Amino acid sequence: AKAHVATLEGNYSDIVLGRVVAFGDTGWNFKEVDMTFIADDADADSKTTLFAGVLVGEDGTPATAAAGVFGVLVDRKVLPGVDHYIGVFEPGEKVPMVLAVRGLTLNQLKLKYADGTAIDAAGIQALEAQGNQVTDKIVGTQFIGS
Amino acid sequence: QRGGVRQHLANDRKKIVNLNIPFFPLDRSIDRADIQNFREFGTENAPATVDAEVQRHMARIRRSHAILKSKAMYAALKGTSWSPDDPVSDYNYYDVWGATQTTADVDFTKLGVDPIEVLEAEARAHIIDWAGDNGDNYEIVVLASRQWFSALIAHPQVTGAYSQYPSTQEILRRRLNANNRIFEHKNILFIEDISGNIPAGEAYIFPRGISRMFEIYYA
Amino acid sequence: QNGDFQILDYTGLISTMPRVDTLLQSMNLFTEHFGRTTVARIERLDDGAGDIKAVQRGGVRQHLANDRKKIVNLNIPFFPLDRSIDRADIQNFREFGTENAPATVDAEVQRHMARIRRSHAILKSKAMYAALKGTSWSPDDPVSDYNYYDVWGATQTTADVDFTKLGVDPIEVLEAEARAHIIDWAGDNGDNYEIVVLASRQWFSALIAHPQVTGAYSQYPSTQEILRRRLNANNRIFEHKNILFIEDISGNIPAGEAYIFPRGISRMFEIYYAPSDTLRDANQAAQELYVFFKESNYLREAKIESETSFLTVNNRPELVVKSTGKF
Amino acid sequence: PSDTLRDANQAAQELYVFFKESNYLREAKIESETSFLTVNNRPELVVKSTGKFT
After folding, report:
1. Which of B38, B173, C34, C38 is within CB 3.0–4.6 Å of C286 for a Cys-Cys bond?
2. Do B9 and A133 touch (CB under 8 A)?
């Protein structure tokens, strides 16, 4: 007797805790990269594995170690709760995406590699080379009590 | 330190769920043969009238509906909806919300161990830790079957406590009209179920208060 | 979810929030001072006592020639908290408990302000308890962590209670050791100070179950008085031999430990405040809690900041007794 | 709506234009944004016509 349930976790403004607002423009911090949305083999049914907060390389391929780290995926099309894209893309279809690179404050608890592993020291210093304040001074990491 | 990095608040969670609703009809009809040529029961020679029968049947219908509502109210405490003979709205809330029943088994044969200290350690601690903030004046209440209550009161570790409790007339002021017994000790209220809705040998504990813990939906 | 054909109707909403303590605040034990500098001064004048003796009419008289003073200085910690909200958080979303109504920035701002205030209140409640233990509250910064007992040149009187000794009344050991001393050293001018015992859950449970006190407890009501002796906490209460016992519910008392303080005694606990790290009030005055709301001049981001710095002070560590026991 | 925080999920306009000055009397910038879709609701009454010439 299923009781259908839907859920979400996190926002856009919890992976990016703050910006540096370049007066001269608004696109200073970001870079636009092109990636494959739906898996290369899965049918046109699978919600892709691009949860916001994954680390991607310079050419858009998802990161796997500290070596291939360039930016943090923050595109609106993969934010939690944004799930009306299921059949809109064919397998292997390749779409632009947005990465945040420069002058940003980053939550250390959200950053992950493509597999799911949490970011490590090597990845932290790699990102922090771009001028990103990777910080772990977050309040809210324990829910309700239990 | 004054000048260094600050802190942030970056947590949240949400859920949403949908459920169905049952249906309960009731109907009656009255023919000519029911009223004509008969008296009204409590008036000797006065002739029978349709209006009296109609009003009596309306009263019976309302009484039956009230009994049904009272029966359905108890099912919420057990954690399941009330809808007999229709497996389309019988929902188990514990699995629906992804929770599990915390079980506090009490052994009444162990004379040397206080029963109402096992509850204090297991159930009341957890119900308060998980209660959540913003809840004002929620009093822990224990609802028990008759056998469970009788076993509890007779336990030697609680005979001394009970013998000194008044248990005379307060039931009319702590509540308003039920004749079921009351026992209050160690900041816990005990009550005996009189409608038989609690299975024999079982008892349940809930915090009361906590606005918007129980709701009734209508269609 | 099966399409727009099935028009949906009202839906309800519920929420959960973390617990907030009110015991110490409800008791009215602390006083607040607003200063300017980051350091607060404490001035403790000490009097002298003596007894007059009879003398004959004409002979030498008597004199009063005693006094003492002390003065000490302390620092203050700092506690920030801040959050930001972007466009992507609000646009194209509903408000959670209103079905089809569009999301608005104001609702999110108000909810975040409420969360910030709740967190600050929780922090203040946590910090209040640290005063009783005799040490200040300032995690992760060994520059304001002060031990009051050595600061004021006092020592903890320890009243160890053995719960395994069935033949000896536990609450008569406390009467002999802690309550006697706390009254002898209480000092004069203190009006209506009631001895209060705050204990961890394990210590209280061990105490109540002790055979020498089962008879006393079984005859105590322990039904609803908690709502009149206090105002709202659900922690249990026991009162016997002119001593009040309470169970800590926030876990701030280490397991197996209990503390005793006299309450009353005006100016025993204090809270000091200092200004915020902002240019417009660097030396102006202090406030309970600063809240700053800034919306970017380019209409693309908004920022929320909160600020508060304070220190809780226990002026008389000599008057607090620490207890421990076996189990 | 424009992506600016002013009108997130608020309303729509044909063309947004902004002009900025640094307030330091040393720089300025110009902004403009639009977001629209052109839709032919009835792709039934438009008929192609191709012609072979010579």
Report:
1. C34
2. no
